């Protein structure tokens, strides 16, 4: 899999200082603690699919193996990254204003 690190969420990242908007900065740290535990719930690799024991234990053949032939060569397309760029776009304009 792939996993990149981050910076320290210690002093600055919870003190964004909006117009008395400490609640929006508090919600920003609350998403990092939730997703890091959901990443700690499941590993990077899933379980392995034993194919040889499937043929003998489910030995009524045809209908068992045809689903196991179609679901084996499938693909899982992850969601889009369209909102990933526009949120990073407003950081470029505000850093020029800061």
């Amino acid at each position: 899999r792939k996993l990149a690190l981050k910076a320290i969420d210690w002093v600055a990242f919870g003190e964004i200082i909006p117009r008395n908007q400490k609640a929006i900065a508090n919600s920003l740290k609350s998403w990092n603690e939730t997703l890091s535990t959901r990443l700690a719930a499941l590993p990077e690799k899933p379980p392995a699919i034993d194919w040889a024991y499937y043929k003998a234990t489910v030995a009524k053949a045809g209908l068992v193996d045809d689903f196991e032939k179609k679901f084996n060569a499938l693909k899982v397309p992850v969601p889009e990254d369209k909102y990933t760029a526009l949120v990073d776009a407003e950081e470029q304009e505000d850093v020029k204003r800061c």
């Binding site: 179609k70 889009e80 909102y83 949120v87 204003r97």
Partner: protein, 70 residues
């Protein structure tokens, strides 16, 4: 007791010779295990015999806000 033993082995092989399946069960064992599995498959799940599952999921729209500083 071996002569009693092979008498048992004879009656297992006449029980092997089947053409209609359950001879002594009748409708009693046929209505039971058909209703027993369907009562258990209702607790198990509605899945087909060969339909492989495939779907997709929608991630959250990462929105932004404004904050005027400097």
């Amino acid at each position: 007791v071996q002569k009693l033993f092979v008498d048992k082995i004879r009656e297992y092989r006449t029980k092997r010779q089947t053409s209609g399946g359950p001879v002594d069960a009748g409708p009693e064992y046929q209505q039971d295990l058909d209703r027993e599995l369907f009562k258990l498959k209702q607790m198990y799940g509605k899945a087909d015999m060969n339909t492989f599952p495939n779907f997709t999921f929608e991630d959250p729209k990462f929105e932004a806000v404004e904050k005027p500083q400097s």
